[PDB]
Symmetry: C3
């Protein structure tokens, strides 16, 4: 049975952190139990006060990252409080059958349901809400996150060597379609339902008004930067459930990258910029060699700097003059 | 000679089916003869009656898939009836020299021409019309399809193991640019030529009005779904001659995928969502493990659910409770 | 030291040519010195007289390609004449640390600075201007080019065999955002600074007005075609610092392609159409087998034929009838 196996509970943590877990494991399959509560709310998504009638898993954008090993069974309890207004569900791209779980988790406000599925394929996978007749709206409103399924003996390079990371960070990139008035000012709506008709008009143009990391412009900049040390190896998980993106680290590289996100395939190395297909999650490894501030962004630079898709990584350590050196500071010709 | 070799004729079949053929073959090179007749017509492309002044190879969108083995010679007779109004030609991406065949097949209404080219490279390749001064228009109006060139000893995995499919289905994804009036209603034109000027204005915005599989919204849904059985392996051929797309199977995966479409390269596995570059055809293999209805779509979900790029696969068989199981149906908290 | 090593100077050449260099080298690391002067100017970017208030490295779009071997140190002297109006800098994606060099090269009009960085990773890399608060504008105005870092023992295939090229050509693809008036005519500005506000409005739509190869519509067509001979192998370097593109050679293929551009990874073969992620440079090898005119373009065909992203290659040699042959010229049915 797929049931009899040990059952364990995981306590989910908010982006950009990832809950504690082991990379390689000497241990057999288990049933990992997770709980997620849906939360509809109006959020401030920029520095000028623009608002979004948003829909979330666990109150954040993106939803939390769930991590298990290849072979485990995922047991998710999805709860939809009576304070919400819309029906919701989940679609795990890492699962097999019934529209990824969506058919078995239709949950109206005040209901809950429990689904179990075998995670028999390795990689980072997107999960998202997908209620019949309104999938694009719930996804674009914030309902997505990642499931990471690690190979039981950890991540490997192309020749089979072991690859380790010291920390993992999870970034969700969201293309947002906030309507504008005649003024040229973004609209504010009193209820979620009221935002609907205008939002679908903007969606159909295919031109986002804002593209943000983790829920807002500047979520991961300045004081909210990601942090690391030179010599530390970081796993950067990047998901985009609806639209393509092309991540890049200014002053760094993707040492080892799975741009399609599936760990059974060999990774590519030394990438300047990688590509995550809308509807998927990818992963990149990097080891910091120089201290200082780094920017992590979508390298359509108008999308990064005008629309919002950019973040910071602040790195501690000692400068290395052999890698890079200013021989002549700026001066008069 | 490349001529002396046996000559054989193939009878072309309409999408989404593919004409009978062998995967591995113990047999030498041959000259495969195919005939295609161009057909200009006005087609209904949605469920609300919107019309398109369309241009086709053999009366369908996409044109039929032609399948040969690596080493064969393709011998195509292109016919352009006197009832059409425009000159046409063909450009095979699988061919070498003279703009892919386009320079040797310029055929005015009432003319025909015969081209022969060696298919010396393995994979799925796009073919499309390409008349000087109006290529984008003929392509966007429906003139494209796929040529599949199989390795003589069939498809293989990365370690060289044999890979087989039970059935093959061919999907053509078309980005359409139908002008709108002041009303906000799509225009209807009496002739093909009359549609031209407005259509090029819409094309230049780069925003399609509709994105459809095989000629219309709902072509492959409900009663027109693709069909399969659990334990059956299907080859899903996907072409897009002008614009990128990112195919995904809800509740399934791409077991083995050639997203750039060329069989001499190793395939990737366990993909949630793959990517077909505009101007190319890719291929994915999957084996059904669970019965039920599956959706096959472009995972920019606004493109799939608002603009039309989505289809269904209806699968017969027995549920497998170990893969997925509802432990607690929806109920009150 | 990284200094003590021999120092050598390279004389930069204009696109589409690449300065003389060796592929494999039996020689150790050196310090290669290069000099680039920034040049702001108004350029004519089409055949109808449209103008662009452009910004360049060395007076061309794209900037010149710099080529070194893996292990060398790049020593760039960046000069910004007193005749320019804006501050500039450089960001090498091939470098590690301080925003790719951008923090150490901030150069106001009338200043110069010298940076040295180790090129420890193999491939074609984009370099671009990136001044704080205005990066998208300087990039989109023309400030980008490629750095090619060759493996010390040359390019290799997947099984390790040596791969050689006879000539290399460098193509920069630029998405341009030239504002339009009420008339429907493109605006002309007296100064660079005056173009700014309108340009950022057009950028935010994400819809280029023009997409060109090397600075203008028709830069590489007709009399300006690239040239080759049958039996010759060409390396086609393609960079796009802001926006995706999907290169294709009509009548040819990418024999061996590094679409993500990094030489330590195995290349893919027999590609009809490849993909360069915005923010990166890729490379493809091809050997001409048939004489005649070839087109090299972005296979979103509206982008290629309406917006400008298309070029020509004129090939000398003898027709090969086995590859392709017209058996029946166009004639009456
Ligand atoms: Cu929902
Ligand atoms: Cu999905
Ligand atoms: Cu045609
Ligand atoms: Cu083509
Ligand atoms: Cu600049
Ligand atoms: Cu950059």
């Amino acid at each position: 049975d797929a049931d009899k196996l040990p059952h364990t509970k995981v306590t989910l943590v908010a982006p950009p952190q990832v809950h504690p877990h082991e990379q390689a494991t000497k241990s057999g399959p288990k049933v990992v139990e997770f709980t997620m509560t849906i939360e509809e709310k109006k959020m401030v998504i920029d520095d000028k006060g623009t608002t979004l009638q948003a829909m979330t898993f666990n109150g954040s954008m993106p939803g939390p990252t769930l991590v298990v090993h290849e072979g485990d069974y995922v047991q998710l309890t999805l709860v939809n409080p009576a304070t919400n207004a819309m029906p919701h569900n989940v679609d795990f791209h890492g699962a097999t059958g019934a529209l990824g779980g969506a058919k078995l988790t239709n949950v109206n406000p005040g209901e809950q349901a429990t689904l179990r599925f075998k995670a028999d394929r390795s990689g980072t996978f997107v999960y998202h809400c997908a209620p019949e007749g309104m999938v694009p709206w719930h996804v674009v409103s914030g309902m997505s996150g990642t499931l990471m399924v690690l190979p039981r003996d950890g991540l490997k390079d192309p020749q089979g060597k072991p690859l380790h990371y010291d920390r993992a960070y999870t970034i969700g990139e969201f293309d947002l379609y906030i309507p504008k008035g005649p003024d040229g000012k973004y609209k504010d709506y009193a209820t979620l339902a009221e935002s609907y008709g205008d939002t679908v008009q903007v969606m159909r143009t295919l031109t986002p008004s804002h593209i943000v990391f983790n829920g807002k412009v500047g979520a991961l900049t300045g004081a909210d930067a990601l942090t690391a040390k030179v010599g530390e190896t970081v796993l950067l998980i990047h998901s985009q459930a609806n639209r393509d993106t092309r991540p890049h680290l200014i002053g760094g590289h993707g040492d080892w990258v799975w741009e399609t996100g599936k760990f059974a395939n060999p990774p590519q190395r030394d990438l300047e910029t990688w590509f995550i297909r809308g509807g998927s999650a990818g992963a990149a490894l990097y080891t910091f060699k120089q201290p200082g501030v780094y920017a992590y962004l979508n390298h359509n630079l108008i999308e990064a700097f005008e629309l919002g898709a950019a973040g910071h990584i602040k790195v501690e350590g000692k400068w290395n003059d052999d890698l890079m050196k200013q021989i002549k500071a700026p001066a008069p010709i």
